[PDB]
Design a protein around this ligand. Structure first.
Ligand SMILES: CCCCCCCCCCCCCC(=O)SCCNC(=O)CCNC(=O)[C@H](O)C(C)(C)COP(=O)(O)OP(=O)(O)OC[C@H]1O[C@@H](n2cnc3c(N)ncnc32)[C@H](O)[C@@H]1OP(=O)(O)O
Ligand SMILES: N[C@@H](CCCC[NH3+])C(=O)O
Ligand SMILES: N[C@@H](CCCC[NH3+])C(=O)O
Ligand SMILES: N[C@@H](CCCC[NH3+])C(=O)O
Ligand SMILES: NC(=O)C[C@H](N)C(=O)O
Ligand code: PRO
Length: 371
C-alpha cells in the first residue's frame, strides 16, 4: 500500500514489527511560527466554543459532514463542550477552516491534553478528535493540512506525542478494537434498519427484555462527594492495562460527573457506606428521526462482579430511553459481551500513537476510551 502523507510522519511503517519503546523523532527546539498554507480562498480560524453561535456552526459542520450511509452521529452543543473543553483545553487547539469570503466553517480538527500511560512510560500527550472536512472539499488534500497545522500548534505548547483513533487502517495501529451492540429497544432498531431479524419479532423482544430495576444493592448516581473515590478506583483499576489515561481529580470530575444527555455515572455504595464500583456511559444519538445510543465509558469493579455491573448498565440505559448500548472489546469487556447478548459490529476502531514507537497490543490491554 502507498500512504502519501503518513510515510512522511513520525509513525512506524505498516508491517514493521516494533520491539522498541520511545519517540520516533526528538522534541523540537524550534517550531514553525507561521500557519501552513491552505488552498486559495480558505483560512484558519480558532473556534471560541464559548460563543453559542460559533459552537452551533461546529455541530452543524459535524452533524452534516462527520462519520453504508444510513446513520450519522448527531453531536449536541453541550456534548461538544464536554468533549472539547476538559481541564487544560486551549482555544487555538479548536482548529477550524473557513471560506475566506463567506466565513462559512468547512473544516475542523481538535486537540485536548491528556496524560497517557503507555507500557512503562507516562507522557503528556494530546488526544486528536473531530477531524472533519466539508463534503464539498473532500479529496482536495485539506485533511493533511489540518493534521500538520494541529501538530504545529501542539508543538508550540511543548507537546510531541498524540493518541487518536480511526475506522481505517493507517501506519500503524497500536491496537485494534471492534464495536459491539446490545439492543435495548429491538422494535425501533429493526424498523429503522439498524438491526435485522434472525426468529419472530415476538421472540426477539423477549430475548432482549431486561429487568425494570438494577439488581446491585447500593447502586446510585455519582455525586460530588464521590469524586475522590471514583478517581481512586479508576487509577487503581487502570494499572492492569497498557494504554490508559492518567487523570487528575479535576479530570475525573469533568469526565464522570453526571450531565443529563451527556454522561451518566453510577456508583455502588455498599452496606458499610464505601463506594466500591462504578459504571459509566455517554450519550451520542445518531440521525437516521433519531437513534438514542449509549456508549460504554469506564467501568471499574472491585466488589460487584463485572457481569452484574454491566447488566445494571443495560438496565439503567433501557430505563433512560436508549435504543442501543454500544461497547468496544477493550479492557475486560470481552468477558461480558457475549453473555449479555451483545452482537459484534461491522466497524473496527484502530488506536494510534503519534511519534511513539512501541509494540502493539491486544484489545484487552487497551484501557483508553475517547469520545
Ligand atoms: C504532537 C501532536 C500530533 C497531533 C497530530 C496527530 C495525528 C492526527 C491524525 C488525525 C486523527 C483524526 C481522528 C478522528 O477524528 S477520526 C474521524 C474521521 N473523520 C471522519 O471520518 C468524518 C468524515 N470524513 C471526513 O470529514 C474526511 O473524509 C476526512 C477529514 C476524514 C478526510 O478528508 P478527505 O476525505 O478529503 O481526504 P484528503 O484528500 O483530504 O486526505 C487523505 C489523506 O488523509 C488521511 N486520512 C483520511 N482519513 C483520516 C483519519 N480519520 N485520520 C487520519 N488520517 C486520515 C488519508 O490516509 C490520506 O493520507 P495518505 O493515505 O495519503 O497517507
Ligand atoms: N454498526 C452497526 C450498524 C450497521 C448498519 C449498516 N452499516 C452494526 O454493525
Ligand atoms: N453486525 C453485522 C456484523 C457482520 C460481521 C462483522 N464481523 C451483522 O451481524 O450483520
Ligand atoms: N463509526 C460509526 C458510524 C455511525 C455512528 C452511529 N453508530 C460506525 O460505523
Ligand atoms: N469504523 C468506524 O467507522 C469507526 C467510527 N468511530 C464509528 O464509530
Ligand atoms: O449489523 C451488525 C450490528 C448489529 C447491530 C447493529 N450492527
Amino acid at each position: 500500500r502507498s500512504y502519501q502523507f503518513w510515510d512522511t510522519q513520525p509513525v512506524p511503517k505498516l508491517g514493521e514489527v516494533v520491539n522498541t519503546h520511545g519517540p520516533v523523532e526528538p522534541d523540537k527546539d524550534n517550531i514553525r511560527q507561521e500557519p501552513y498554507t491552505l488552498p486559495q480562498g480558505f483560512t484558519w480560524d480558532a473556534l471560541d466554543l464559548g460563543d453559542r453561535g460559533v459552537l452551533k456552526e461546529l455541530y452543524t459542520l459535524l452533524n452534516e459532514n462527520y462519520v453504508d450511509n444510513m446513520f450519522r452521529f448527531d453531536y449536541s452543543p453541550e456534548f461538544l463542550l464536554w468533549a472539547l473543553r476538559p481541564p487544560g483545553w486551549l482555544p487555538q487547539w479548536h482548529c477550524g477552516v473557513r471560506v475566506v469570503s463567506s466565513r462559512k466553517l468547512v473544516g475542523f480538527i481538535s486537540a485536548i491534553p491528556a496524560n497517557i500511560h503507555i507500557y512503562d512510560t507516562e507522557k503528556k500527550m494530546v488526544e486528536i478528535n473531530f477531524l472533519c472536512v466539508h463534503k464539498k472539499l473532500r479529496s482536495k488534500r485539506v485533511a493533511p493540512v489540518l493534521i500538520r497545522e494541529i501538530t504545529r500548534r501542539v508543538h508550540l505548547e511543548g507537546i510531541f506525542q498524540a493518541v487518536y483513533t480511526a475506522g481505517v487502517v493507517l501506519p500503524k495501529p497500536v491496537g485494534t478494537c471492534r464495536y459491539w451492540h446490545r439492543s435495548l429497544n429491538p422494535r425501533k432498531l429493526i424498523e429503522v434498519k439498524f438491526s435485522h431479524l434472525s426468529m419472530t419479532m415476538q421472540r426477539t423482544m423477549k430475548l432482549y427484555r431486561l429487568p425494570e430495576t438494577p439488581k446491585t444493592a447500593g447502586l446510585r448516581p455519582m455525586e460530588t462527594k464521590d469524586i475522590p473515590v471514583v478517581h481512586q478506583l479508576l487509577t487503581r483499576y487502570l494499572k492492569q492495562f497498557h494504554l490508559t489515561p492518567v487523570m487528575s481529580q479535576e479530570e475525573v470530575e469533568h469526565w464522570f460527573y453526571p450531565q443529563e444527555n451527556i454522561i451518566d455515572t453510577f456508583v455502588v455504595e455498599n452496606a458499610n457506606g464505601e463506594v466500591t464500583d462504578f459504571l459509566s456511559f455517554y450519550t451520542l444519538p445518531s440521525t437516521i428521526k433519531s437513534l438514542k445510543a449509549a456508549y460504554s465509558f469506564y467501568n471499574v469493579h472491585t466488589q460487584t462482579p463485572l457481569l452484574d455491573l454491566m447488566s445494571d448498565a443495560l438496565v439503567l440505559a433501557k430505563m433512560k430511553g436508549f435504543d442501543v448500548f454500544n461497547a468496544l472489546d477493550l479492557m475486560e469487556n470481552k468477558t461480558f459481551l457475549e453473555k449479555l447478548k451483545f452482537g459484534i459490529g461491522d466497524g473496527n476502531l484502530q488506536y494510534y500513537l503519534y511519534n511513539w514507537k512501541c509494540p502493539s497490543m491486544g484489545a484487552e490491554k487497551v484501557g483508553l476510551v475517547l469520545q
